[PDB]
Amino acid sequence: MKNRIDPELRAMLDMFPPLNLDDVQATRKAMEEAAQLTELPVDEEVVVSNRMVPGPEDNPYVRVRIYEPKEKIEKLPGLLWIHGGGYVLGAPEGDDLLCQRFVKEANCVVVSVDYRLAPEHPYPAPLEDCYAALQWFAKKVDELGVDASRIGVGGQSAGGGLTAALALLARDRKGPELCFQMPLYPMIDDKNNSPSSLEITGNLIWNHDLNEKGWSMYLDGKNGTDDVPVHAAPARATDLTNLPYTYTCVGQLDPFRDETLDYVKRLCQAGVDVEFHLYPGAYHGFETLNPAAAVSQRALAEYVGAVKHVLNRE
Amino acid sequence: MKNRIDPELRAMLDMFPPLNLDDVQATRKAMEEAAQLTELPVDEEVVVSNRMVPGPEDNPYVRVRIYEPKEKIEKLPGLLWIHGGGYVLGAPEGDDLLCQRFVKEANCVVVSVDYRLAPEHPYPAPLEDCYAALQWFAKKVDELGVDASRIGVGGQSAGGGLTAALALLARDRKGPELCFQMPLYPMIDDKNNSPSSLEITGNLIWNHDLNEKGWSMYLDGKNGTDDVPVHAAPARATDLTNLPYTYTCVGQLDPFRDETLDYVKRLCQAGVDVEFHLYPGAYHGFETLNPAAAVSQRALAEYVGAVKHVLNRE
Ligand SMILES: [Mg+2]
């Protein structure tokens, strides 16, 4: 698709080998080796810690990674953050730069979830870990210096899917209150049969074949069948009423373009307040892979600004 | 729920006397008298001129209003601008401030069409006047100091519908080349039956009842029937292939929300480059009516920036 891709995004596609989910163990080991080569500096304005918190009943405690301002004088809003990786890869540490940016620009506390991964822990384990982390965050607002009426949830890709699912689950459980959801370019349609999901086939970071493998591992082979609940695949939701204010965005060359457009359309029809941005010439994860690109800098500034505006509004 | 309107947009909406299209002749006479009580915006960096250009067979001359930089030392891109007004109101002069902004920020020549209005001149008259203006603009690029490979078209509301229609018509006629289309919150679906159209019924600048009247006058009572060509109502297009790079945006509380989302989706599926922004809490024409509002300033800067980016790239 070379001619369709923004020129500032092309060079990074050649710079890294196409992702492979035929060997998930090997892919995770490779990503962890990459992570060790690229360690962030300490940012002196943001204090980062890990904590073990009670998990879902009869399940392991959940690790969360907490980012807070070095100086707290007044009560702050909160953001639950959920990393991506197809439901099968990833760790909170991968998103330290962005979480530190949300703390500094939104003046908030971020709690990032180390959810269990598929295929070892399929649905509902990853979502229940996110829900346990949200319960802990709401319960500990005293100690964190947070306002429980100003907690939102956000994430990218599979983490965006878990964000949209968690907003539905917390609504349905009269669960902790959420003031905002930011399901960025979210993996929400297990059927993998939208035109955009079918069209994106090659080395464009995420594609139809990767999506098929991630959904198969998350849903233990029930992907695409009638035996998939709304909380596993939010595209299946028919009742989107009484969900939180939503910000999302997607690149037009992301396989998730069409499911994202459809979710936005249905949220608006359900009376949910939505801001949505479709970016031209842009593939999945463009803004994380190409930080120097003008379109990446516009996209990052806008969704950091959404967190700042919505979590702090009167 | 008026609580869903952005607080910065509320005060102008209560001062807005609700539009009445039961007597279009009386409404135009009123708007022209209002215009005469206020001097038109001038700008020392922009030179404004009026020209009569050959029209369709129907209307041998069409007036265009031309905005250019005071200092032209190189070849510039061009923007054909199409004002809004429901197909039944308006004149180029109403958009002088925004056309001057495109000249100054995009460093372009703007040609704004004084198209014939419905119901006196129903479809196809308004679109054929725009097409005649585009033919003249392409023909006179050497005289205007414009690059024929860098001409776009843009407009708002009914002008956005004419923009989308003119991109289809120029494609179909192998008509002058367009490098960009900017059909902002465009009036493109004559059926007036989308969920967003039925949702927006009150005093929110444009609504279901006004939309029915504008379409009935533009299409001489054939609105909603099988007797409506794609060039009269671009929502009817099934072939969106080979259309120019598109920017569009819409407020969530605009009746055009759903038809705008659906056209964006179909453009992307046809392989057209598209940027789209949905703004929360925002009604039709918010950014023109509320220049002080933060969401207005973001929206205006983004679509002025799209003109600048797309007309000057490569
Ligand atoms: Mg299948």
Author numbering:
A (entry chain A), B (entry chain B): 1 to 314
Task: Share the article's original sentences.
EstN7 is a member of the HSL (or IV) family with a α/β hydrolase fold and consists of a central eight stranded β-sheet surrounded by nine helices. Unlike many esterases isolated from psychrophilic organisms that still have optimal enzyme activity at greater than 20°C, EstN7 is truly cold active with an optimal temperature of 5–10°C with a dramatic drop-off in activity above 20°C. We have previously shown that EstN7 retained function in the presence of up to 30% of various organic solvents, which makes it potentially useful in a variety of applications, such as fine chemical synthesis and pharmaceutical industries.
EstN7 was observed as a dimer in the unit cell, which was confirmed in solution by size exclusion chromatography. The two β-sheets are connected across the dimer interface via an antiparallel arrangement of strand 8 from each subunit to form effectively a single continuous sheet, with residues in the C-terminal helix and helix 8 also contributing. The active site lies at the bottom of the cleft formed by the cap region and comprised Ser157, Asp254 and His284. In both subunits, S157 adopts two distinct hydroxymethyl rotamers with approximately 115° between the two. Electron density that equates to ethylene glycol was also observed in the active site of both subunits, with an additional ethylene glycol found in subunit B. Analysis of EstN7 solvent accessible surface area (SASA) shows that the second helix-loop (residues 23–40) is not tightly associated with the catalytic domain as is the case in related structures but forms a bridge-like structure that reveals additional potential tunnels to the active site not present in the closely related mesophilic and thermophilic esterases. Thus, EstN7's cold adaptation mechanism is likely to include dealing with change in water entropy and allowing improved access for substrate to the active site.
